[PDB]
Structure 1
């Protein structure tokens, strides 16, 4: 005695987890914003009441899409640049000993070599100042990348500065944002909203320290796909940024050598004045209190009476064993030994100085056979950044001892994107629905 019939409803607010291709939006640069949709002056956020959604930062396809887009943009920006195939020549290198400190012992090589000119039948004897990490002995030396692939000198006019990027979904798709503070990136989120696209995310390439990122608005956040598994990288998000001041104080000189028709190689001529190591400075008290916050947050996961130890990176490439980043076109690799060096037991104005080594030959992503040569930057360089998080790895894990050791980690830039896209997911709207109603056609 029901006499119910099918009734079709179009425009129903129902969605399903889906993977699609988000497009860029933003307000010469490597991150090509000239192909991005203009961002709306007043973006609209729809706050969904009574909606609880399942989120998982460690299986988000947005991270993979961002990784692919960033790699593609990096490749695109380098295509219309000079290829330094002639640079693979025998180098007559001597030690740069004019006005050097004891920490720059043999770190710079004054290398003279023959080079091609615009005329095919003429050669020019030139010289350049290379870094010890960029050359390898065969007094005779050759560039490190010569036995793997030819390097592409980045065009100098293109800037490496991160620019915020918004990832907006196509029609029929929505971006659900988890507004729940204290959210650890996985599980039900009861405070949900719909956004045309996220906040402006800057693609900051850094290892062992998340830089110029977002800050937790409540407290330090510890996130891990499986915290009990030591193989999983722990993402730490700060609530108070730690100011870091990184400088190369050498007054570098950039000379230009015509290596062919319309092709210029930018060499380091001579350093004006004293030569001393590039470095970074981090406030000691701020770092200590941030580490205390991280320790008391980790105690929730690893017990209240455990010993929390911070030590050096285990080993590997220079990219991962050191805080690797870019500061105004020059690629720094900083020995973060004064930061993660302490033990914590449950119970003024100086700063930690991290020495840094500069590199010109760069393999940014974990790829072999695709290298980039950074042209030298004219003059001293200084840059100030916010440390907003960490990429830690837990050492050991056996139950014999009651101490937990965390070491800096990185290498894979997907984690860097994951720390910004943790509170976002993509869904596809299913407007069609069928329901029972007493109405009959």
Structure 2
């Protein structure tokens, strides 16, 4: 053989798939916003990109551990924000409730309870009457009622000074690691792709949590994309990413009042009541023409996958808990559950009634519940529907699904992969001591 010797090279541009901890980074720009108070060292506005001319890397969004990290990080931040501030154990008392009917529309007739109760401020065996309105969904009958979660969990008051308003977060690689991404249009989210480039920090993603509809986040480059782990398997969710937003306007058109109740030595409970003006049902408007056009685009792409000679329809989801069956978001600080039966009703403005809850069992666990204090004044917000989470049941039927928080991030993190740099190797050559 040719008398070539082993030559060792350090600084070799090679890598392997790896799982590590990525760090939070943000803008230089919100004083009590948990995403901003999480420091998240400001990113460098200048992307590196470094196009890799002949790199064809293999991706699999359904196995992306970046999604798992984001899920874990969100939960951890959320939980630590609830360590301080008021615990509401003292509210697990008998309530005496009436139906709140002195200024209502009829569709709201069964929604509010008056609920008077005995609570104290001193260990003086001196209780005082306190009343607060509650939404029906938070109160369960034992005239005598109790809060819904006092039977199974601790109730913690969300601290009113703390905001969870989503701020786009960029994930950045630790030293020794790099993030690679696909730039291809019409990419599956899986399999190989050319035109791979490098990332120090990902684009910022807002940690928006929702059910059924994907809000804000980002849009597809040209056409609505349909992605799934196992497309012929009806046990999987289909993530549909729109190439244009559908604008949705939501509101809570009730001028409310926050009532501060002393609950302990330096502790306050936020009660609600004495709503000013007419009491009306919360709702979302969804532009109608846009929605219909958007479905037409989705249907065309579903046909490419399921046959251009069949007929599909959209049904009003399925049964189960509100956390599953309704659309969920929390703009303005209050939690909304909306009926999407008005959207997923077709075979190939739309007002969606909404309900509001104050006692929230965050999806991620049981044994604890969060109490959302009431918001003073009224709530209005506008958002972009950017996608859908669908399941499928000749013809075929599709239904809104999801509910797994990770689907809302997986749909954004389908372009990025984490690799470890291993800059050491050998090759035969002409190089003799």
Q: CA deviation at 1:120?
A: 3.9
Contact 1:211 1:385 in 2 (8 A): yes
Structure 1 residues 156-186: Cα deviation after superposition (integer angstroms, max 9, x where no partner): 1111211111110101100001111111100
Check whether the contact 2:333–2:375 (CA below 8 A) recurs between aligned residues. yes
Contact 2:36 2:167 in 1 (8 A): no
Q: Distance in 2 between matches of 1:309 and 1:336?
A: 15
Cα offset, 1:323, TM superposition: 0.1
- CA–CA distance in structure 1, aligned partners of residues 403 and 361 of structure 2: 11
Cα shift at 1:35: 2.9
CA contact (8 A) 1:31 1:74 kept: no
* Contact 1:160/1:328, CA 8 A, preserved across alignment: no
Matches of 2:2 and 2:13, distance apart in 1: 27
Alignment partner of 1:89 is 2:87: no
Normalised to the residue count of structure 2, the TM-score between the two structures is: 0.98
Compute the displacement of 1:380 (Å).
1.1
CA distance in 2, matches of 1:89, 1:373: 16
Using the TM superposition, give the Cα deviation of residue 37 of structure 1 relative to its aligned residue in structure 2, in angstroms.
1.5
Specify whether residues 425 and 33 from structure 1 end up closer, same or farther in structure 2 by C-alpha distance, changes over 3 A only: farther
Q: Given that residues 183 and 196 in structure 2 are in contact (C-alpha distance below 8 angstroms), is that contact kept between their aligned partners in structure 1?
A: yes
1:6 match: 6
Give the 3-state SS of the residue equivalent to 1:301 in structure 2.
helix
Is this contact kept in 1: 2:212–2:390, CA < 8 A?
yes
Shift of 1:119: 4.7
Superposed CA deviations along residues 225-278 of structure 1, whole A, max 9, x for unmatched, are: 010001110000001100000000011110000000011010112110000100
Q: Which moved more, 1:369-378 or 1:23-32?
A: 23-32
Query: Is the 8 Å Cα contact of residues 119 and 260 (structure 1) preserved in structure 2?
Result: no
Deviations 1:315-374 (A, max 9, x none): 111011000110111000000011000000xxxxxx000000011001122311121000
Worse-superposed segment, 195-204 or 118-127: 118-127
Contact 1:154 1:372 in 2 (8 A): yes
Contact 2:43–2:201 (CA under 8 A) maintained in structure 1? no
1:348 corresponds in structure 2 to: none
The DSSP-based 3-state class of the residue aligned with 2:201 is: coil
- The Cα shift of 1:32 comes to 4.9
1:134 pairs, out of 133, 138, 162, with 138
Deviation of 1:44 (Å): 2.0
The equivalences for 1:22-421 within 5 A come to 22-27=22-27, 28-344=32-348, 351-395=349-393, 402-421=394-413
1:192 positional shift? 0.5
Cα displacement string for residues 128-162 of structure 1 (whole angstroms, at most 9, x for unaligned residues)? 00000000000000000001112111111111211
Kept in 2, the 8 Å contact 1:223–1:236? The answer is yes
Contact (CA 8 Å) 2:120, 2:264: kept in 1 or not?
yes
CA distance in 1, matches of 2:33, 2:397: 40
Q: Quick one: distance in 1 between partners of 2:38 and 2:413? A: 23
Contact preservation (8 Å) 1:366, 1:411: no
Shift of 1:439: 1.7
Contact 1:88–1:146 at 8 Å: present in 2 too? Answer: yes
Q: After alignment, is 119-128 or 13-22 more displaced?
A: 119-128
Give the aligned partner of residue 347 of structure 1. none
3-state SS in 2 of match to 1:115: strand
Deviation, 1:64, is: 0.4
Preserved contact between residue 118 and residue 258 of structure 1 (Cα < 8 Å): no
The 2-side partners of 1:120 and 1:437 are apart by 89
How many residues of Structure 1 are paired with residues of Structure 2 in the alignment? 429
Superposed displacement of residue 42, structure 1:
2.0
In the TM superposition, residue 116 of structure 1 has moved relative to its aligned partner by 1.6
| Structure 1 residue matching 2:403: 3-state secondary structure | coil
- Conserved 8 A contact 1:284-1:352: yes
Contact 2:170 / 2:202 at 8 angstroms: preserved in 1?
A: yes
In structure 1, stretches of 5+ residues that fail to align are 345-350, 396-401
Question: 2:334 & 2:124 partners in 1: Cα distance?
Answer: 32
Are the aligned partners of 2:315 and 2:397 in contact in 1 as well (CA < 8 Å)? yes
Segments of 5+ residues of structure 2 without an aligned counterpart are none
User: Post-superposition shift, 1:43?
Assistant: 2.9
The verdict on how the C-alpha distance between 1:177 and 1:33 changes in structure 2, with shifts beyond 3 A counting, is farther
Contact 1:226 1:232 in 2 (8 A): yes
